[PDB]
Design a binder for this molecule. Structure first.
Ligand SMILES: [Cl-]
Ligand SMILES: [Zn+2]
Length: 464
């Protein structure tokens, strides 16, 4: 009849690690099996590479400057979503769907309309990698979703399973902070990425120069060697395999009932992880693909299999998931929502409405450093601007997908730069963005040493 929906979201999950995108084998087989039945987008940019802003934005179908959840800080710095704002869950709930949510919330009110159940951490010992409450909560989340999908009560439903992993990578970094010899592992060690090194630190913006100061985990990884970073990637894959096994459990529960086959499965992330690219660990300030270009996978009744990743559209899950699911469910979407339904692409029809560019925002994490930034991703180039120092990046995503050569200061590229600044102005105007009025709050002690993370000195912005 009317379709059910199962949204499986993972914190930190990256395209590179997901086999469906063609770079890594062996980490996400169950996700790749869903993908093979359906469609995956190659350009799927989140409106902010940080948990709370992305999630606030996602489930209300807005951008972060509009929700006013621009960091992981609570009220009053950030504002909870008012109950008069339509939401994925209110839209679906008001139409007669049962709407349930399991796992990580971190939503600041944007989950309104979902009946939420809190997972209970179920601890266990891993013999090779550090595991913590992130991993343990996921055992609970998985048990909750399994029990629900193994017996609904009832249909039509929409269900979200919000997993923590591979977020446990953060705990790994803390256990392996600073100069160190790595704990031996039994796997083959993954190679560093081709974009690992930063070739010229003078040619990236001030806030990116000093992520080692403002970001605790960059502080902790600042002086790591190549073995260290390669163990970081092995651990990322481990936690990715861990959550994939839970995705597998949840899907087995889905298809153990007749409801399963009438269910549209979406698989995504709120943001990704640096994975050593550009020396990065986790996420902070920067807009590189590793962090802002997430897995975005659909399969189910009425969605046509496409073997080739959709790479001719710029997608923005943060905006587009709300309209896409509402479309497929036959629910009217409030005209103020700026997202675009991908349901035509998913049904194997031509996509006549599409995003001419997609955007991402940075503000702060916990308001130690406030250094607002904006990314504009056009059909071919990615442009970056930061207020602090008026820094700019410009990257050729066709010939330099690894983002190793900033072209912003290359005269050959000035009309391309002008054109992309002009898109940012378009975004700022149409979205009512206050970017240009915003103030930096970046202590000079966090901009002290020579640019770049290996040259980092001191404890970082934590003090104070
Ligand atoms: Cl911060
Ligand atoms: Zn530093």
């Amino acid at each position: 009849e009317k379709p059910n929906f199962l949204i499986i979201q993972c914190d930190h999950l990256t395209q590179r690690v997901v086999g469906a995108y063609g770079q890594t084998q062996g980490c996400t087989l169950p996700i790749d099996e869903v993908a093979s039945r359906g469609v995956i987008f190659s350009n799927a940019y989140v409106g902010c590479p940080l948990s709370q802003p992305s999630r606030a934005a996602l489930w209300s179908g807005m951008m972060p400057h509009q929700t006013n959840v621009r960091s992981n800080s609570s009220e009053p710095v950030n504002t909870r979503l008012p109950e008069n704002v339509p939401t994925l869950g209110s839209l679906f709930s008001e139409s007669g769907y049962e709407a349930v949510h399991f796992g990580k919330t971190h939503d600041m009110g944007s989950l309104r309309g979902f009946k939420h159940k809190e997972p209970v951490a179920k601890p266990f010992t891993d013999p090779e990698f550090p595991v913590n409450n992130d991993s343990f909560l996921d055992v609970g989340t998985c048990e909750d979703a399994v029990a629900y999908l193994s017996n609904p009560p009832k249909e039509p439903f929409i269900c979200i399973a919000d997993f923590q992993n591979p977020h446990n990578i953060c705990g790994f970094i803390g256990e392996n902070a600073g100069v160190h010899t790595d704990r031996p592992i039994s796997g083959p060690l993954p190679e560093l990425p081709d974009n690992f090194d930063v070739e010229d630190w003078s040619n990236i913006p001030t806030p990116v120069q000093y992520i080692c100061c403002s970001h605790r985990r960059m502080t902790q990884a600042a002086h790591w060697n190549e073995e260290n970073y390669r163990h970081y990637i092995a651990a990322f894959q481990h936690y990715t395999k861990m959550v994939s096994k839970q995705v597998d459990s949840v899907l087995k529960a889905l298809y153990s009932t007749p409801a399963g086959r009438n269910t549209i499965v979406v698989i995504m992330a709120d943001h990704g992880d640096g994975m050593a690219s550009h020396r990065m660990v986790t996420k902070h300030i920067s807009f590189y693909d590793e962090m802002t270009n997430v897995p975005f996978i659909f399969a189910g009744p009425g969605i046509k299999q496409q073997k080739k990743p959709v790479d001719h559209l710029l997608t923005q899950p943060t905006l587009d998931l709300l309209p896409t699911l509402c479309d497929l469910a036959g629910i009217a979407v409030p005209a103020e929502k700026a997202g675009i339904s991908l349901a035509p692409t998913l049904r194997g029809e031509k996509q006549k409405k599409s995003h001419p560019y997609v955007v991402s925002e940075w503000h702060s994490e916990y308001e130690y450093v406030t250094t607002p930034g904006r990314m504009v991703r056009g059909p071919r180039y990615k442009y970056t601007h930061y207020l602090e120092g008026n820094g700019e990046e410009l990257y050729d995503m066709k010939k330099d997908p690894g983002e190793r050569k900033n072209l912003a200061k290359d005269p050959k590229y000035s009309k391309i730069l002008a054109e992309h600044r002009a898109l940012l102005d378009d975004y700022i105007t149409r979205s009512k963005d206050d970017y240009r009025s915003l103030k930096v709050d970046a202590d000079p002690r966090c901009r002290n040493h020579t640019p770049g993370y290996p040259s980092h000195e001191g404890p970082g912005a934590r003090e104070i």
